[PDB]
């Protein structure tokens, strides 16, 4: 725990990707249910979530050519969500809009580093590999199911003038009693419709997030339920099938409900290979980055790891000396961490360089090697 | 693939609006009442009311106002529907043939726009210069009232104030001016804007923006010679008019928030006000300009949805929660200190929250026992056909569930009342209700809270009432534990036990725990005039539903469905479980098939395997929409009601073709009802060679009751063609398309009504004239029952419709 | 099977001299290829036991890595620049032989070889 003087903005900039990139201020958004023909990247094996920052390093000449093509066009590519990762099956996915690129010369081979951001969910209609080797995808955009307030269907026309509202636990009971009055007309009570109210679910998630992220809910967290649900899903350390199940959800109410179910149920994080080897707990999770405790980063090899930052970890051997080369958190040296039983790569132990920093040491675990566990 | 038939057995009796004007004649005084999808016109006489006309529109009346532009002889009626169908109608009478004509009609639904939280707000300028509509946030629609505007064309104006509470057209102005109340990060304010028809824009009002009460809600436009606006909230009734600023704060209104109002004197000297609990206050204005405001307590009426002053001191009170009232206002109070005397009472069945069917009097003659009303207007309603005889048993507390037990000749009814924190310590009621005036009342014994109580806040207390079937006395009133909410109720015999029991499911609800993690299942027996607790079982969640399942107890507990056996030691023993992705709110059964339903339309059909001793998933469907009630029609059909007053029917395929497609429930039936269905239940009200198979009644929020039954393919096709031919010949009130009315309409998508026959349209065939009958039957020959094509005359379809009317 | 010993970096019987070409190869070529981000698979000999490649040293008869070249430059083992250039090219060829053309490591090796050959044309002559 302790306190922090690190400045949580540097992790989101991905300063390790060379100098200042060519940032773009535009944005392209397709229509709902509209079909598009989008190119897919071959080496990307991540399940992308809207709003999630995605850095990438591509050196293959085919990849660099496709990157140039996209830079000259609408700057949008498709990231597949693989259900079976080995056979290249894809039923769902998320698009990503490139917002920074950097091709580097005075370098061995021609390489390009790109910062993109997930945009819109989609269903995979057709996958066809071209003669080039790169594969295109005919794709249908999936819309956001924004359902209205459940009381609007049973609202009394006399009470229409009461539906606007000018120690925190009494204000929420006042809210529940005033907004869901007409619930007496149905077969269900007010507290039941309080479980399907996006604002109450958002407040409960804000409560569970003030444990990890010390930033206030004033400016950091969005106010829209869909943006809030996606931001929460971006930093939920779960395994791949759970992330796919969460991505299938259309109604943001159901998304927030499932996220609260996960946050209340799963408490321990174990090794995905061991299944019975506790690595850490939900308590030790803290946010070193603005986007949350768990964000996507890229290594020199070009692989993408979703690093979750925790204060303490258990049952981890440390391999090798610390190193500062290509460190995702400047001012910290990483050290490879393996499971104490199966020796699988769990993450890295980041120790501070300067002795006046805080925290002096923390852990960054990759999501793909973790497994949620309830007692 | 659905082949269903829905009919209205009882029209909606709930009142959602009432006005007074001169609609039929310039000398007659007319009272217009809106019952959702019904319009009732009356003439005010010295005795009371004289029924002149009742019409049925193809839309839920959201706004209803009378007005008279300079040039006409009598008033016209502006009407808006929930689907944004606007129209202006006139009354026309020639001898005995009355027909409501359509002066102007049109759709005003925007292409883009988020519907506002305050809903549809429609106002009319006094001098009849324009109509202002407030539908979406930050957009004020204006419909000019010139003689050439028969399309009802309109234009939008931009609002810098996004969160508008209420708005009124002010009297006594050269230009049409609106005065509204809004909110911003600073607080709540009131402001005025002048609407320009030349520039189609806003101009600075006559008086600037003032800061007002934090809970300022209602706005009242005061007519001449006064002018200005009155702002009413929870603690203050203020008045603004240019330089005039007058604020009062009487403590008599602090107990309950005022909701509706009406004008008494045309010049604006006296006003009636109704609050939530049902009280009626009088707001007096003292005179060229205002001198002071005064608020007196007139007395206790029904929980008013709307109010209107007739004449000679007679006032009509339209109540959706309770019965409609006509009351008298005396000059001198009576003995208890109340200026109110009830003149007449009209029945109101809304809101129906549960019901059942019993063979009370005759055997075979079904009768419907329903829970209706809420708070002091709650009651039981016994309905039988003779239009429909309805007996009322008042309860003065809110009923929630009900079931019938034959061997005991009585009913079990879950009920809830409101109490307040005692000055010392404990609770005290507001009125003596059924649970506090029973011949015997008990409390249960605990078998298992920090930051206790507050300063006089409301709390709900739940009871189980055993009520005789002959006398309807509250025989017993068993009170449940503190902070315990009763949800389900079933009367059944279980296992090899000959005793019949009342089983209740309850949840331990706390403020801090949003999701209840604690609940009970209790089993009572009633005999010899006393209730004893036979069995108790603790569970780790809310018992949302319970069902009699072939002699066992099928109970839902949050995200779990469990089966209980009845042991020889009279206990509840778990046999098997099933852990779902959703929380099981709705539970139904037929044979071994089990239906599970979530609030967001998540449906799951399971099957009990008797040789395995476990549950198995048969099918499931996930489509997000707010539900309200579910029902199993037959082995393959499943009916349900969802958001925007819509019904739907899903189907499964037993044989089917592929392992993947066998686990899907197709969306085969869709229909727009106009009513929020709260309860489905099998039964029929007619004495038991019939085209229909099955019978499921359903109760609604606005007091409407309906019946659904399946059909055959040929009969469905014939009735659909009949519906088309009848739409092409019948003149609609307001000129609204029937298919547009019955179209499954949400704000996200709109599709036509498939797999459903609107029984009201098929019934209206008998009302029209014989030439129109010959019009409809002309060139029919859609009979596909024999195998070829059989013709159809007028008498054939007359007899067909008569037999279709002989099912309710 | 198991690992072989690394190539010897020091040899007291071998002479020690610091020519212009070798000090250039140490201070420029090796330094440039060292701080390159694609250098991580070549900064040490191939640990065939960990990577589970039993057939690497069966195919690669002459191993070589950039760490061995660095330890040979620091200990003055090199007599002329031709031996250091041959060591670099032998490392590149050993990387090319074992893997398939089109793998990630092959493209990284091609990158490093291109940078080495573009830094090797600027060869200063002996003082
Ligand atoms: Zn492990």
UniProtKB/Swiss-Prot annotation, chain A:
Residues 38-267 form the Lon N-terminal domain. Residues 266-374 form the CULT domain. (S)-thalidomide binds at residues 326, 328, 334. It is a peripheral membrane protein. One of its GO terms (molecular function) is metal ion binding. It is found in: Cytoplasm; Nucleus; Membrane. Widely expressed. Highly expressed in brain. Substrate recognition component of a DCX (DDB1-CUL4-X-box) E3 protein ligase complex that mediates the ubiquitination and subsequent proteasomal degradation of target proteins, such as MEIS2, ILF2 or GLUL. Normal degradation of key regulatory proteins is required for normal limb outgrowth and expression of the fibroblast growth factor FGF8. Maintains presynaptic glutamate release and consequently cognitive functions, such as memory and learning, by negatively regulating large-conductance calcium-activated potassium (BK) channels in excitatory neurons. Thalidomide was widely prescribed to pregnant women in the late 1950s as a sedative and as treatment against morning sickness. Thalidomide was found to be teratogenic, causing multiple birth defects. More recently, thalidomide use has increased for the treatment of multiple myeloma and erythema nodosum leprosum, a painful complication of leprosy. Interacts with KCNT1. Component of a DCX (DDB1-CUL4-X-box) protein ligase complex, at least composed of CRBN, CUL4A, DDB1 and RBX1. Interacts directly with DDB1. Interacts (in pomalidomide-bound form) with IKZF1 and IKZF3. Interacts with ILF2. Interacts with TRAF6 and ECSIT. This is Protein cereblon.
Curated annotation (Swiss-Prot), chain B:
Residues 13-349 are annotated as: WD repeat beta-propeller A. GO terms for cellular component: chromosome, telomeric region; Cul4-RING E3 ubiquitin ligase complex; Cul4A-RING E3 ubiquitin ligase complex; Cul4B-RING E3 ubiquitin ligase complex; cytoplasm; extracellular exosome; extracellular space; nucleolus. GO terms for biological process: apoptotic process; biological process involved in interaction with symbiont; cellular response to UV; DNA damage response; DNA repair; ectopic germ cell programmed cell death; epigenetic programming in the zygotic pronuclei; negative regulation of apoptotic process. Its main location: cytoplasm. Pathway: Protein modification; protein ubiquitination. It comes from the Eukaryota. Signal peptide: none annotated. One of its GO terms (molecular function) is protein-containing complex binding. Changing residue 626 to A: Impairs interaction with AMBRA1, ERCC8, DCAF5 and DCAF11. InterPro entries: Beta-prop_RSE1/DDB1/CPSF1_1st, Cleavage/polyA-sp_fac_asu_C, RSE1/DDB1/CFT1/CPSF1, WD40/YVTN_repeat-like_dom_sf, WD40_repeat_dom_sf. Protein, which is both involved in DNA repair and protein ubiquitination, as part of the UV-DDB complex and DCX (DDB1-CUL4-X-box) complexes, respectively. Core component of the UV-DDB complex (UV-damaged DNA-binding protein complex), a complex that recognizes UV-induced DNA damage and recruit proteins of the nucleotide excision repair pathway (the NER pathway) to initiate DNA repair. The UV-DDB complex preferentially binds to cyclobutane pyrimidine dimers (CPD), 6-4 photoproducts (6-4 PP), apurinic sites and short mismatches. It is linked to White-Kernohan syndrome: An autosomal dominant disorder characterized by global developmental delay, variably impaired intellectual development, hypotonia, and characteristic facial features. Some patients may have genitourinary and skeletal abnormalities. This is DNA damage-binding protein 1.
From Swiss-Prot, chain C:
Phosphorylation by CK2 disrupt the intramolecular binding between the bromo domain 2 and the NPS region and promotes binding between the NPS and the BID regions, leading to activate the protein and promote binding to acetylated histones. In absence of phosphorylation, BRD4 does not localize to p53/TP53 target gene promoters, phosphorylation promoting recruitment to p53/TP53 target promoters. It is found in: Nucleus; Chromosome. Residues 17-123 form the Bromo domain. Transmembrane segments: none annotated. Signal peptide: none annotated. Chromatin reader protein that recognizes and binds acetylated histones and plays a key role in transmission of epigenetic memory across cell divisions and transcription regulation. Remains associated with acetylated chromatin throughout the entire cell cycle and provides epigenetic memory for postmitotic G1 gene transcription by preserving acetylated chromatin status and maintaining high-order chromatin structure. During interphase, plays a key role in regulating the transcription of signal-inducible genes by associating with the P-TEFb complex and recruiting it to promoters. The NET domain mediates interaction with a number of chromatin proteins involved in transcription regulation (NSD3, JMJD6, CHD4, GLTSCR1 and ATAD5). The C-terminal (CTD) region mediates interaction and recruitment of CDK9 and CCNT1 subunits of the P-TEFb complex. It is also required for maintenance of higher-order chromatin structure. Belongs to the BET family. This is Bromodomain-containing protein 4. It comes from Homo sapiens. The gene is BRD4. The chain holds residues 42 to 168 of 1362 of the full protein.
């Amino acid at each position: 725990p302790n306190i922090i003087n690190f400045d949580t903005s540097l992790p989101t900039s991905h300063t390790y990707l060379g100098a200042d990139m060519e940032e773009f201020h535009g944005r392209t958004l397709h229509d709902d249910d509209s079909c598009q023909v989008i190119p897919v990247l071959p080496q990307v094996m991540m399940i992308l979530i809207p709003g999630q920052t995605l850095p990438l390093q591509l050196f293959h000449p085919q990849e660099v050519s496709m990157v140039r093509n996209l830079i000259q066009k609408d700057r949008t590519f498709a990231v597949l969500a693989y259900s079976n990762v080995q056979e290249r099956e894809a039923q769902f996915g998320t698009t990503a809009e490139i917002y920074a690129y950097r091709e580097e010369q005075d370098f061995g081979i021609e390489i390009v580093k790109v910062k993109a951001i997930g945009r819109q969910r989609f269903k995979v209609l057709e996958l066809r590999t071209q003669s080039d080797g790169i594969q295109q995808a005919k794709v249908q955009i999936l819309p956001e199911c924004v359902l209205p307030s459940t009381m609007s269907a049973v609202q009394l026309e006399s009470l229409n003038k009461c539906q606007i509202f000018p120690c925190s636990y009494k204000w929420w009971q006042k809210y529940q009693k005033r907004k869901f009055h007409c619930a007496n007309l149905t077969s269900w009570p007010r507290w039941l419709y309080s479980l399907y109210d996006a604002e109450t679910l958002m407040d409960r998630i804000k409560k569970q997030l003030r444990e990890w992220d010390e930033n206030l809910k004033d400016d950091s967290l969005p106010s829209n339920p869909i943006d809030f649900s996606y931001r929460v899903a971006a930093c939920l350390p779960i395994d791949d099938v759970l992330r796919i199940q969460l991505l299938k959800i259309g109604s943001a109410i159901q998304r927030l409900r499932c996220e609260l179910d996960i946050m209340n149920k799963c408490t321990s994080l174990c090794c995905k290979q061991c299944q019975e080897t506790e690595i850490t707990t939900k308590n030790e999770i803290f946010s070193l980055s603005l986007c949350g405790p768990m964000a996507a980063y890229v290594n020199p090899h070009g692989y993408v790891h979703e690093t979750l930052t925790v204060y303490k970890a258990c049952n981890l051997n440390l391999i090798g000396r610390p190193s500062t080369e290509h460190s995702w958190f400047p001012g910290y040296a990483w050290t490879v961490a393996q499971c104490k039983i199966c020796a699988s790569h769990i993450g890295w132990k980041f120790t501070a360089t300067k002795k006046d920093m805080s925290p002096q040491k923390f852990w960054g675990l990759t999501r793909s090697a973790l497994l949620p566990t309830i007692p | 693939m659905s082949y269903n038939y829905v009919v209205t057995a009882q029209k909606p009796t709930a009142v959602n609006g009432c006005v007074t004007g001169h609609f039929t004649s310039a000398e007659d005084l007319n009272l217009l009442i809106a019952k959702n999808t019904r319009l009732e016109i009356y003439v005010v006489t010295a005795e009371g009311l004289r029924p002149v006309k009742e019409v049925g529109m193809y839309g839920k009346i959201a706004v209803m106002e009378l007005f008279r532009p300079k040039g006409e002889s009598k008033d016209l009626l502006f009407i808006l529907t929930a689907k944004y169908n606007a129209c202006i109608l006139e009354y026309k009478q020639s001898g005995e043939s009355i027909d409501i004509i359509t002066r102007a009609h049109g759709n005003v639904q925007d292409r883009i726009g988020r519907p506002s939280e305050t809903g549809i707000i429609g106002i009319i300028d006094p001098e009849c210069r324009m109509i202002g509509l407030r539908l979406y946030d930050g957009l004020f629609k204006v419909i000019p009232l010139d003689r050439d505007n028969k399309e009802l064309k309109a234009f939008n104006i931009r609002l810098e104030e996004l969160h508008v509470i209420d708005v009124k057209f002010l009297y006594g102005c050269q230009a049409p001016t609106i005065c509204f109340v809004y909110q911003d990060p600073q607080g709540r304010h009131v402001k005025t804007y002048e609407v320009s028809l030349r520039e189609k824009e806003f101009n600075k009002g006559p008086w600037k923006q003032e800061n007002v009460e934090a809970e300022a809600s209602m706005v009242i436009a005061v007519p001449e010679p006064f002018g200005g606006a009155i702002i009413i909230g929870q603690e203050s009734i203020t008045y603004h008019n240019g330089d005039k600023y007058l604020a009062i704060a009487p403590p008599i209104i602090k107990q309950s928030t005022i909701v509706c109002h009406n004008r008494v004197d045309p010049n604006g000297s006296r006003y009636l006000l109704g609050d939530m609990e049902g009280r009626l206050f009088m707001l007096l204005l003292e005179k060229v300009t205002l001198k002071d405001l005064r608020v007196e307590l007139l007395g206790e009426t029904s929980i008013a949805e709307c109010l209107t002053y007739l004449d000679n001191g007679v006032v009509f009170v339209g109540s959706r929660l309770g019965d409609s009232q006509l009351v008298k206002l005396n000059v001198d109070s009576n003995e208890q200190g109340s200026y109110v005397v009830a003149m007449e009472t009209f029945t109101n069945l809304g809101p129906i929250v549960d019901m059942c069917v019993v063979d009370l009097e005759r055997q075979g003659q079904g009768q419907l026992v329903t829970c209706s009303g809420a708070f002091k207007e709650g009651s039981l309603r016994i309905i039988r056909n003779g239009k429909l005889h309805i007996r009322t048993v008042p309860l003065y507390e809110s009923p929630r569930k009900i079931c019938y037990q034959e061997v005991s000749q009585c009913f079990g009814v879950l009920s809830s009342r409101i109490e307040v924190q005692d000055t010392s310590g404990g609770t005290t009621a507001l009125r003596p209700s059924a649970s506090t005036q029973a011949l015997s009342s008990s409390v249960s014994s605990s078998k298992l809270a920090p930051h206790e109580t507050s300063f006089g806040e409301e709390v709900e207390v739940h009871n189980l009432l055993i009520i005789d079937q002959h006398t309807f006395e509250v025989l017993h009133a068993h009170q449940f534990l503190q902070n315990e909410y009763a949800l389900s109720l079933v009367s059944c015999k279980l296992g090899k036990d000959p005793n019949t029991y009342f089983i209740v499911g309850t949840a331990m609800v706390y403020p801090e725990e949003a999701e209840p993690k604690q609940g009970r299942i209790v089993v009572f027996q009633y005999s010899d005039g006393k209730l004893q607790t036979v069995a108790e079982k603790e569970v780790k969640g809310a018992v949302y539903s319970m069902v009699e399942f072939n002699g066992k107890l099928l109970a839902s507990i949050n995200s779990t469905v469990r089966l209980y056996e009845w042991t020889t030691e009279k206990e509840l023993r778990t046999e098997c479980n099933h852990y779902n992705n959703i929380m099981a709110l709705y539970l139904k059964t037929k044979g071994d098939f089990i239906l599970v339903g979530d609030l967001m339309r998540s449906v799951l059909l399971l099957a009990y395997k008797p040789m395995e001793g476990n549950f198995e998933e048969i099918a499931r469907d996930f489509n997000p929409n707010w539900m309200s009630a579910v029902e199993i029609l037959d082995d393959d059909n499943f009916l349900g009601a969802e958001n925007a007053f819509n019904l739907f029917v899903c189907q499964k395929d037993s044989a089917a073709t592929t392992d993947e497609e066998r686990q899907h429930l197709q969306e085969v039936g869709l229909f727009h009802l106009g009513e929020f269905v709260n309860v489905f239940c099998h039964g029929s009200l007619v004495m038991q060679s019939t085209p229909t198979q099955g019978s499921v009644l359903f109760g609604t929020v606005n007091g409407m009751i309906g019946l659904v039954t399946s059909l055959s393919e040929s009969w469905y096709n014939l009735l659909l063609d009949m519906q088309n031919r009848l739409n092409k010949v019948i003149k609609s009130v307001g000129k609204i398309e029937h298919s547009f009315w019955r179209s499954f309409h949400t704000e996200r998508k709109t599709e036509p009504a498939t797999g459903f026959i609107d029984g009201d349209l098929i019934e209206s065939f008998l009302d029209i004239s014989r030439p129109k009958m010959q019009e409809v039957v002309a060139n029919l020959q859609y009979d596909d029952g024999s195998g070829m094509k059989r013709e159809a005359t007028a008498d054939d379809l007359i007899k067909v419709v008569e037999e279709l009317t002989r099912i309710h | 099977s198991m690992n072989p010993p690394p190539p010897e970096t020091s040899n007291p019987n071998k002479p020690k001299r610091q020519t212009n070409q070798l000090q250039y190869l140490l201070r420029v070529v090796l330094k440039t290829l060292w701080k390159h981000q694609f250098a991580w698979p070549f900064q040490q000999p191939v640990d065939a036991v960990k990577l589970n490649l039993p057939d690497y040293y069966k195919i690669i008869k002459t191993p070589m890595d950039m760490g061995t070249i660095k330890k040979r430059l620091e200990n003055n083992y090199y007599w002329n620049a031709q031996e250091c250039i041959q060591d670099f090219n032998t490392m590149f060829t050993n990387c090319y032989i074992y893997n398939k053309p089109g793998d990630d490591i092959v493209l990284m090796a091609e990158a490093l070889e291109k940078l080495f050959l573009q830094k090797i044309n600027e060869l200063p002559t002996e003082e």
